[PDB]
Amino acid sequence: SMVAWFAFDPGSAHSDIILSNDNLTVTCSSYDDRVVLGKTGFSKGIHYWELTVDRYDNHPDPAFGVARMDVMKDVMLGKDDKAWAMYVDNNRSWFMHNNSHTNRTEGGITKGATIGVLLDFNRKNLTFFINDEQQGPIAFDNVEGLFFPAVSLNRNVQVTLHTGLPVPDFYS
């Protein structure tokens, strides 16, 4: 297929991660944010996938992005130097990498929201979407090497992974 179909990798997950629904749905047992990765790694081309927010209780900062296979699994994505992510609450997002917060953007998530992640190895960049609108500027501009889709979240969030998608501009 022109699109990639994948699920989360149970072998990538922190022990507190709960995978369900053919490894397409994830939550966590802990108040602490924990990581899971996609099973398919990307190193070239352009790839888009989405997360649907099934549950968003209280005001946590789940994170979405890409990571190396050896990213820290027990902390928010982007606390270490092996993930590039957007974290977002009900109000606003930030981008994070190496414990550096950048490009705060107004607008957040709620139950039913969609988060899109556009990983572009030809432009070496990473762009985020919320509800089919670009969230902030291009987040990062030195994308290279092998990356896996990545999520971090805690017990206040559940998300479902949607793959088999083309790039956001594919139609119309």
Overall resolution, Å: 1.5
Name the CATH superfamily housing domain 8-162: SPRY domain (2.60.120.920)
Spatial separation of the C-alpha atoms in residues 170 and 168, rounded to whole Å: 6
Quickly count: other Cβ atoms within 10 Å of residue 170's Cβ.
10
DSSP string, the chain: --S----B-GGGS-TTEEEETTTTEEEESSSS-EEEEBS--B-SSEEEEEEEEEEE-SS---EEEEE-TT--SSS-TTSSTTEEEEEE-SSEEEEEETTEEEEEEE----TT-EEEEEEETTTTEEEEEETTEE-SS--BS---S-BEEEEEE-TTEEEEEE-S---TTS--
In whole angstroms, what is the distance from residue 153 CA to residue 87 CA?
Answer: 10
> Do 158 and 54 contact (CB within 8 A), yes or no?
yes
Q: Would you say the C-alpha torsion 135, 76, 120, 116 has a positive or negative sign?
A: negative
Q: Are 88 and 171 in contact (CB under 8 A)?
A: no
